[PDB]
Design a protein around this ligand. Structure first.
Ligand SMILES: [Cl-]
Ligand SMILES: [Cl-]
Ligand SMILES: [Cl-]
Ligand SMILES: [Cl-]
Ligand SMILES: [Cl-]
Ligand SMILES: [Cl-]
Ligand SMILES: [Cl-]
Ligand SMILES: [Cl-]
Ligand SMILES: [Cl-]
Ligand SMILES: [Cl-]
Lengths: 261, 272, 260, 261, 260, 272
């Protein structure tokens, strides 16, 4: 069923099981290319889900033949080929604002305390990698691939891939080679490197597994699960001593839940 | 048969400490009838034990294992209830201050392993559940038997792990999709996946073969200069938590005294 | 032989367009790192950083192995005859030497052109400090890596303890390697992720390293060099700080012709 | 003149000189007490000004007898006396969201790259201190006073005072004593401690000086001035080495301005 | 004399409700800090931190002056007869002693009850490490502060070089004080902001220190102790990180009766 | 009259370096006909000078002053035009990379003062404009004459200060309202306000009285153990940039070698 609070041009949001929302990228005719409305609707959607007491986990997938072809290069041209501002300095301030806004599209996934699972089939290109590396857990079909395309287009990726990809897998030689060459990384290598936790034969089976996972997470104490995501995120970005201090301050209130007794 | 020294420095209810060659101490979780469940004395005795080992000039490496059928079942829920079901303080704020102190003190049980400048090797067989994962993620090296499993059980009990797993597990392996899945689902991770993910360094067919390998590793570490090995642990931990530029600065300030040792002179004159 | 590059311990060539190949060149002494080497690396990579024509670098070793590590004769001169009266004064002297030796591999990281290590045979001690300061690592089937410093009576202070734990995931393994000085062979280096590819022999490995450097050089150098700067920044900072930095970085770099 | 983009219940925004906006807290009958609409309108206002190429500096003052009496305690009761959520843990998540939202009310001043000058007469109590310590420059009339009131109300200040006050003046013994006792700090002591840069005999003279300052800042290169605020803010929060690196990366584009040639 | 508090070097009394008064008590030796002192401070402040009845602390010195600083007899035992064979082993031994001595003043900062220093006469060397770990500083007109360590042949390692620069604004002054070991008298301590009030004599100063401790104790202890925790966090972190922390902190602390 | 050593280590166009007692070096900005305007050679020679002083075992403190009527007029706008009016590189991105390198290199001119472990005392008379404020905020101690003024001039020229003022000025004084006002308005701050704000430690009636006081301070610092004084600077700088807990850790690691000096033994045996 269609989730009622959620009406979007570029996204389709459904209740997939109790406490589980399924957010589907929904421009299959355009291979889910990320146009301007997408960047704005993701922010709207995520922020809603974060405030949704009924939602305990999210799955993100793509409609059609592939997860995403990445940024709508028609729309990306409008911003870069006609930039507002007189001299270079004023164009700089303008472009910085744009980059920061697009970063927010994926930040909202991280800021959402409900776990978010990426279920990727077919291509996940450019902006798609910025998306899935901001999700907590990644699954894919056997036909999936991941590509840090930005270098081919003529820029260092700036909406999250270079910030999150190196922190979600161990092999930095591989991270560097993908970012510098824009080569496609296919499903078995995605699994071998730990970019995905599991590979499935096809999209249908992948989606069933991702929803089963989300159902399993939904069965746990929401206070516990959401406190866990908050604290894992914190730990990624701070020393162990700082993160130990933070969890003590976090759980001093959270241990006072009915879910515990 | 193991016999104590004539003046034993280690006498615990929940732990057994033995000497397993020259320079190697073997710390064994020792409540096998309760599957090494971590009760109130355990949290105290671990701090007392590792602080003593830190100051023990003769110890160069430590192995930690569990007695009986499994490494550990985790927190003794009887004793954890006393703290959480009867919390001291009037209102919510005052209860918070009280719980914060308890969390911090329990964190110290495993902080002491990390603060100990001697390498510490976890040798896990059977279940390593909840508290056990907080324990082993604070060790430097992890080995296990074929029958071992690791379980971030806390979410099943109704809390986010707050004594070290969520702070150290994500720093000891590369695959964060896996880290997140384990933490959110409390599922069991068996020995073969633990090796593939890099949570353990080596898997062995049985507890006896594992334990011998862990002691032999400890003995190999104990053969090197203790200045160099202890300096290596200090600097690896510092590097985990700081930028490369800060950590390069730190190691230069650390080694400016540590290079002034006959250990280096003897090691260079030997290889020359 | 590249114009502007002459060294006692290093050989620099530039066959492929935009690509420089830096070769450790004391095969006679297994490319052991003597004093000249520490200085010439700095000179070499600082030149490379300022070369608008260079887009990528490969580093390999002449002869039977990548490197045996530090030349223990020369390391003795510094440590067996240290300048200064008392301990505190000796310490200040040693600190400066450590910091200078760290610069030898720092310059690789400061060079915004990607640097690919191509390792065959042993890569020992100082050689691990070197390759963990490179962006990408390839090796031959005969390769091995060894954090040799504890066997010599010191914690590694040149770079290995600072970069090795950040370039692979398995910390249990990193710790075991650092505490025991044991050799890690090619198959294990591949499986741990220390290297991203293994090749049958030096020749095929070197060819692949250079073909990778060509593929990199086929890209916009603004984009590629901006990628390296931001990957390095991201390693050392929180996600939020690194997102801030990339926005401030690309606000100029997006105004390039290679993009329009 | 009334600024046209700016229509608020709790704020009055005027063009005070070319390139200068004057934002006036506008509930003089309620001593400019900070009610719910205030917290939401400040965010709206600031974010607008940040995107306003015509604006180069801001002055903030209070209508009526005093700068501000602080939080509307009627409205603060609604949030704390009737908190949403079942057990303590769920109330905690609810209250954290509230604190974070109210923090954003003053964050938007800092995030605005135009310099913001606080012109304080009469009382500046509680939330007023959280406000003025998020401004770049502070002026006051001789009758002004500042009071970290929160401890009297029964809480540690959480919307910015404890985070910014210690970073804007040198004397931490004084900072600590104000925060722990909630005592009023009068104008001469505000000047002596450096909390304000200057004191004026009355509100009228204070406001003229603050506008003169803002006019002086407006006369400079906007690229230079706004780059300066960005970089001072950065320097407060990072080491010298990190901040030197950041300014090099910042000015590599900004030095390519027409204002420079 | 407070129940649970007996010490060789310290006297602890509790006249005013919720207030403890800790007095350095070797007037005979100008409250020079001998070995017992280093240990008993830790014992004392850790007890204070766990005392729900205590809301504020004043620290003063018995006799003619606040403190002459470290007892140079006892500091010799540690430095003139250091345990360990070679330099590296001596270093590990010294590092542990430094860290232990730092704990003596760390505990003041970890104590979430505000601690007010009331200084008269000299406050020398170890005494500056002490008072810069306190939240608030008052002094008598005869007081003076002296970063004495360089005169003894060391950089201050107990706390002064870490906290003194963070408690006042004028770094030119902090640097001059640290490099020269010169005395700063009461009028200068007031003008630099090292102390927030100066009083004519010890008696009036002590009275004011205690009246301040009363004023603090008249407030909600949840609010006051939460204020200290968050001020300390804010000193050590960015504004954005500290705003995050206070939100996570108050989400529980706002659920207090002292508020409703 | 000052005479050079028989083998002078300091020979500069833009700087004069003299020895002003035992252990004290006096570095004088020396382009008085151009009001000590910082031209291309100045940025180079400062780096060469301070790196040499850093490695000079006999120097224990440095005073920096200016020749002629004023401390400095700041950047030589002729030479700054060459870099900014004719920037190397095709497009905007390529120009950016070029400017970034120039900014970084100019930052090094003052970084070297900070990296020098000997205390450095600025003795300012007359104007200290733009670049001069970047210079003196990198020094450890600041004195001035009655006629001195400080001016963060950069905004008047059309840029945010990028060679150190905006990174160090806000860390050397407490009043940030004042810091912000100075930076945004480029107004002049006279000697009496500079003292009240704490930017200078002392003000003197004239340049000669100031200069004598600065040398006497340098001589007083030069009377102390160089291990202790140099360790003090290193640790003060580290404390500026790190949390108290990190800085306590650092000083323990630093002093574990530095306490092993006869300087300490002699200082304790003297006072005993
Ligand atoms: Cl994996
Ligand atoms: Cl692995
Ligand atoms: Cl070395
Ligand atoms: Cl891998
Ligand atoms: Cl380039
Ligand atoms: Cl002031
Ligand atoms: Cl000491
Ligand atoms: Cl003051
Ligand atoms: Cl309390
Ligand atoms: Cl002052």
């Amino acid at each position: 069923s269609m989730a009622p609070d959620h009406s979007y041009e570029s996204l389709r949001v459904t209740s997939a099981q109790k406490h589980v929302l399924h957010v589907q990228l929904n421009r299959p005719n355009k291979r889910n290319a990320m146009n301007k409305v997408f960047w704005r609707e993701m922010v709207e959607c995520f922020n809603k889900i974060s405030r949704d007491a009924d939602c305990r986990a999210v799955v993100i997938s793509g409609a059609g033949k592939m997860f995403t072809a990445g940024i709508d290069l028609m729309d990306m041209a409008s911003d870069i080929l006609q930039p507002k501002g007189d001299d270079v300095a004023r164009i700089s301030w303008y472009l910085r604002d744009i980059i920061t806004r697009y970063q927010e599209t994926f930040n909202v996934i991280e800021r959402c305390p409900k776990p978010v699972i990426a279920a990727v089939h077919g291509g996940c290109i450019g902006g798609g990698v910025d998306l899935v590396t901001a999700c907590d857990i990644r699954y894919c079909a056997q036909d999936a691939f991941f590509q840090v395309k930005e270098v081919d287009v003529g820029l260092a990726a700036d909406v999250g891939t270079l910030q999150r990809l190196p922190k979600v897998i161990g092999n930095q030689s591989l991270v560097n080679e993908l970012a510098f060459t824009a080569r496609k990384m296919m499903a078995d290598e995605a699994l071998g490197s730990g970019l995905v936790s599991r590979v499935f034969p096809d999209k249908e089976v992948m989606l069933d597994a991702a929803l089963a996972l989300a159902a399993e997470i939904s069965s746990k104490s929401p206070v516990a699960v959401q406190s866990t995501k908050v604290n894992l995120l914190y730990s990624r970005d701070h020393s162990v001593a700082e993160s130990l201090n933070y969890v003590a301050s976090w759980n001093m209130s959270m241990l006072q839940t009915q879910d515990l007794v």
